[PDB]
Symmetry: C2
Subunit: 117 residues, 2 copies
RNA sequence: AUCGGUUCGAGAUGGCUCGAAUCGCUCCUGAGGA
């Protein structure tokens, strides 16, 4: 059972906007998502499960970069500034994968391990 | 020199809004900060220096939680929903420390090391 | 006019229906205006 604070924490960590999360994860309007983050309405179960699943996918993304850093190379990571240039390189992905790509790449750029292209 | 992608990456990692960074870090209008992130105008050096200094404060905070994690403790971290609630417990801080606190609390909640109150 | 971001207000309160402030896109002459 979630809490509005930790729901907002997971949403802000994965670099999602309110309307993007409302359309693609909630399937609700943005006002309903704002009422879930405010505690006026209780967070549903499936939203909790899907956000925990997306955090697991983020851990699977970080494991391969740790695997490459174990091999002594220095990775180059793609930081797409716009969704259309992301979809030019990615046929079968959406805005969630773009946000996950940005949130994974920003971490390893800030820690000094990798480079952004 | 710092590219616009790296500036946007560090800004989105620290959970700062455009207007907040434009007022306190940039001391400019938000229209100019969008030009620095869009690539129409070059990033000034004194913004680069400030963002790297702030990221070092974040690394210091993560080390400070990790030294408590080394004791076998399960730390209960504080996530603040509002700026005035943070200012009640931190009279001499401002909005930047609130955002940094929120990012560190979200990161340690997500990976299972900590609990949120 | 139209379209985006952030923060909020009501209502037999439901994953619902209506609204508000402000910053932008656009136009003019690290800035100011409608």
């Amino acid at each position: 059972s979630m809490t509005n604070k930790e729901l907002q924490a997971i949403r802000k960590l994965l670099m999602l906007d309110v309307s993007e999360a409302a359309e693609h994860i909630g399937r609700v309007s943005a006002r309903s998502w704002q009422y879930w983050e405010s505690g006026r309405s209780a967070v549903p179960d499936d939203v909790e499960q899907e956000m925990l699943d997306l955090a697991s996918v983020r851990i699977e993304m970080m494991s391969a970069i740790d695997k490459r850093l174990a091999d002594g190379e220095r990775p180059k990571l793609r930081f797409y500034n716009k969704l259309d240039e992301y979809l030019a390189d990615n046929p079968d992905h959406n805005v969630i994968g773009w946000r996950l790509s940005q949130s994974v790449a920003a971490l390893y750029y800030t820690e000094g391990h990798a480079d952004l292209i």
